[PDB]
């Protein structure tokens, strides 16, 4: 099992995008996914002010700059991987479809409809 | 004679003859939404009271005589004071703390009755 | 004790003592519209079931004993299996294909009863 960095695509696809402190970061994760089988690791990041949200075209926003210095601390709680595929498998970071980030939280829930009427045989007569 | 709430200051037994008077009075896009919310709410409130009467065995009635005994701890007064001296507004205040207890008892006695009636058929 | 749907895994006769538990749980402009639609629908669904009980002669009841015989072709089982072994979810699946037939029969026997009761008065 091998890990590899992302394949070519747009910045929003190949990097780790996140919004923190009010600014939009695009970090290079090639330092995390570079191994066979299995201090700190420093990931460089780029910053953008003009943001096209989701996968829409035609509606851009400008993110005002944030004064001062930004510091963020967060928890990585999971990964989105795509399998590249006869004795080995390669996994690469994936993403770009936001539904995958909510599917991971809503997986435990189901919605059902209540149907309160029913009939059954009993031993009585009106 | 009297219209809506006209009997509000009357005694409990003078009132309670006017039950149909009050029962019948319960029935720009943002502006339109506010009005629908008002109408939907009136319907929902109406239905909750009707459902509640239903589970107590009082569906379709304005006066419903039940089979739950009155506990003297809820109100230690005789019929003369309650029906001939007090008004419904005063009464509601007097027994406010027991309303949920009474409602629970009414639901339970109906469940027991409803099952006994099945066994007899 | 148990709350809403707590008896869902219980047998049919263990359940059916909790009928009031489930019965009571049935009760930016675009966002507001979506919520009104949800509320209007809950009311309409409630009323359709109540109308249906009404035409079958079961208005105001949670348990209603009717005068329609059970056809062995709908479910060939004895009371012991149905009420002591099965759950309501299992039962609903077992007789799904006969629900509309049963409902039609209930409507008709009530129409006949309702007319006989007029002739006797």
């Amino acid at each position: 099992i091998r890990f590899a960095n992302s394949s070519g695509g747009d910045l929003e696809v190949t990097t780790h995008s996140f919004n923190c402190g009010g600014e939009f970061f695009y970090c290079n994760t090639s330092g995390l996914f570079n191994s066979t089988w299995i201090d700190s690791i420093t990931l460089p990041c780029r910053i953008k002010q003009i943001i096209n949200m989701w996968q829409r075209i035609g509606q851009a926003m400008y993110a005002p700059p944030i004064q001062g210095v930004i510091r963020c601390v967060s928890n990585i709680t999971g990964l989105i991987l795509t399998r590249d595929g006869s004795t080995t498998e390669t996994f690469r970071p994936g993403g770009g479809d936001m539904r995958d980030n909510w599917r991971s939280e809503l997986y435990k829930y189901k919605v059902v409809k209540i149907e309160p009427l029913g009939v059954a045989p009993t031993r009585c007569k009106r | 004679f009297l219209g809506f709430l006209g009997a509000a200051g009357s005694t409990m037994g003078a009132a309670s003859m006017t039950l149909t008077v009050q029962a019948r009075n319960l029935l720009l896009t943002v502006w339109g939404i506010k009005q629908l919310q008002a109408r939907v709410l009136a319907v929902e409130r109406y239905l909750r009271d009707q459902q509640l009467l239903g589970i107590w065995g009082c569906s379709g009635k304005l006066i419903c005589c039940t089979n739950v005994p009155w506990n003297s701890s809820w109100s230690n007064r005789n019929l003369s004071e309650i029906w001939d001296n007090m008004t419904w507004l005063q009464w509601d205040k007097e027994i406010s703390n027991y309303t949920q207890i009474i409602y629970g008892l009414l639901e339970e006695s109906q469940n027991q009755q409803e099952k006994n009636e099945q066994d007899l058929l | 004790f148990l709350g809403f749907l707590g008896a869902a895994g219980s047998t049919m006769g263990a359940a059916s003592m909790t009928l009031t538990v489930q019965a009571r749980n049935l009760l930016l402009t675009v966002w507001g519209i979506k919520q009104l639609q949800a509320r209007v629908l809950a009311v309409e669904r409630y009323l359709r079931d109540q109308q249906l009980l009404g035409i079958w002669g079961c208005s105001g009841k949670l348990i209603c004993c009717t005068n329609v015989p059970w056809n062995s072709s709908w479910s060939n089982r004895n009371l012991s299996e149905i009420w002591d072994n099965m759950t309501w979810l299992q039962w609903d699946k077992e007789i799904s294909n006969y629900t509309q037939i049963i409902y039609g029969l209930l409507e008709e026997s009530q129409n006949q009863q309702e007319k006989n009761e007029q002739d006797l008065l």
Partner: antibody, heavy 124, light 109 residues
Amino acid sequence: EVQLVETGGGLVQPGGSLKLSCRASGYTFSSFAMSWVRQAPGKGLEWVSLINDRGGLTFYVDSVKGRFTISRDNSKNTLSLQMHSLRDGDTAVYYCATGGMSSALQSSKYYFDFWGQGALVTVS
Amino acid sequence: ALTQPPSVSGSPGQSVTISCTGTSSDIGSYNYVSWYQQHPGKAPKLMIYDVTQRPSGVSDRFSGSKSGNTASLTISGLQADDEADYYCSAYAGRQTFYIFGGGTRLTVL
């Protein structure tokens, strides 16, 4: 094997009262309807009273209807029969029995499955 | 109520029949006619219930049926151990729940 054990006094004056009871074991008490049946000292059996499994419905034979009360307590597995007034004609063996009715959501009985040994009651 | 006053008898191995006669708005219309066995000094035992059925634990020497307003109990391979009084009863409807007939003494010869 199940047991029904009648207890209670066997000798009273007419015009008095008498309480009989019956302890049950070996079956779910709360699942069955129960009844009392008399046996006259020299004759046959007579039905006296019937109570529902839940204790809510009671039925009596006309001859004791205004005098006897049948009662049940499912937490102690017991029946009781409270006699009042008492007549010489009530002298009999009183049997505790399981059966008699049904629960309407279960197959019917309308017969008695189990009998106790019988309490003997004499009215002087 | 129900009736059958005579004693009944026969030798071991011979069958015997015990009848039980009632009325139409009683035994005729309701198919709930049990039979009970009682040895003197003992509590009754259920032998037949409903009309033809027997409880588990009851031998197949005991069977029964009804016709019109009369029910009957049949004992086949009669044993000396069958010397007991036999009673019939019936569900007589609501209001009058149960009635019993007089018992008949079975004598084995």
